[PDB]
């Protein structure tokens, strides 16, 4: 029994709303709202809590971090990050929460920091090879991957991907994606890393590609039903869910899921209370 949790986002401005999808009831619910309006935050499930990391409050990029206890339905502040980070990616690897890249209000970041829940402290780890704002991240096979994004040095949306090894504290480029994707959704399903949508300038992608670490190669799968950048992504019960996002002009309220056995994308019949982009998405135990 899982619940999909969707936190904040732009609809069209930063909001506090936190919605949960109950797969058994097949209904959405509003749960405890974020203490402050947020979009473009990282989102992870760790130690039974949902961590909302950084983001944008409509005015400033922030270094705040809050954790949500699904049982108590309560948000609590945790230690601020070292750096302001908005449009970062966040992931858990070996019990540490990583905040990867993003934008601090000035420039995109190659820096990365990690959070130790035992000490409630953040510390920098090795930076990425490239600055990446609007970066997606995923963990598979004990490695952390930073996928696409935007590099202000070259003013390019990125087709490159790099992988972090926590044992050596090193980032290394892996195989390049087929196309540039800033704002790609990233998920992991059946030992494959998915890069979902994104954009290259005003060109928003409906294409999706998958990466196999054992072969270090990418290939494309079925297109989504619609173009999406800044969509949230999670894996549930053998399917990959893609939540909201925008098509470059409008924020989307729809969710669609991918079935890797049928190579088909299906739009979920029940949409969120409103179209939202840049929302944090994760899955928790019910």
């Amino acid at each position: 029994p899982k619940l999909m949790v969707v936190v904040g986002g732009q609809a069209p401005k930063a909001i506090r709303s936190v919605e949960c999808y109950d797969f058994k009831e097949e209904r959405w619910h509003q749960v405890a709202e974020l203490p402050s309006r947020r979009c473009r935050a990282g989102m992870v499930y760790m130690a039974g809590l949902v961590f909302a990391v950084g983001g944008f409050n409509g005015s400033l990029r922030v270094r705040t971090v809050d954790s949500y206890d699904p049982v108590k339905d309560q948000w609590t502040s945790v230690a601020n990050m070292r750096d302001r980070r908005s449009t970062l990616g966040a992931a858990v690897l070996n019990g540490l929460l990583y905040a990867v890249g993003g934008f601090d209000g000035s420039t995109g970041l190659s820096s990365v920091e990690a959070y130790n829940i035992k000490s409630n402290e953040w510390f920098h780890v090795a930076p990425m090879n490239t600055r990446r704002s609007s970066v997606g991240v995923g963990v598979v096979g004990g490695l952390l991957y930073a996928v696409g994004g935007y590099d202000v040095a070259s003013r390019q949306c990125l087709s490159t991907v790099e992988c972090y090894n926590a044992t050596t504290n090193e980032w290394t480029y892996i195989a390049e994606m087929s196309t540039r994707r800033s704002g790609a959704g990233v998920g992991v399903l059946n030992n494959l890393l998915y890069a979902v949508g994104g954009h290259d300038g005003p060109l928003v992608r409906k294409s999706v590609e998958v990466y196999d670490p054992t072969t270090n190669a990418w290939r494309q799968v079925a297109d989504m039903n619609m173009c999406r950048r800044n969509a949230g992504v999670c894996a549930v019960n053998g399917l990959l869910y893609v939540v909201g996002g925008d098509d470059g002009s409008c924020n989307l309220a729809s969710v669609e899921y991918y079935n890797p056995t049928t190579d088909k994308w299906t739009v979920v019949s029940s949409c969120m209370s409103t179209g939202r982009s840049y929302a944090g998405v994760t899955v928790i135990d019910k």
């Binding site: 473009r40 944008f56 449009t87 704002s133 609007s134 935007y150 202000v152 800044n230 840049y278």
Partner: peptide
Amino acid sequence: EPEEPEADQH
């Protein structure tokens, strides 16, 4: 400062 994400700033 611009409210848009960095990738969207011009």
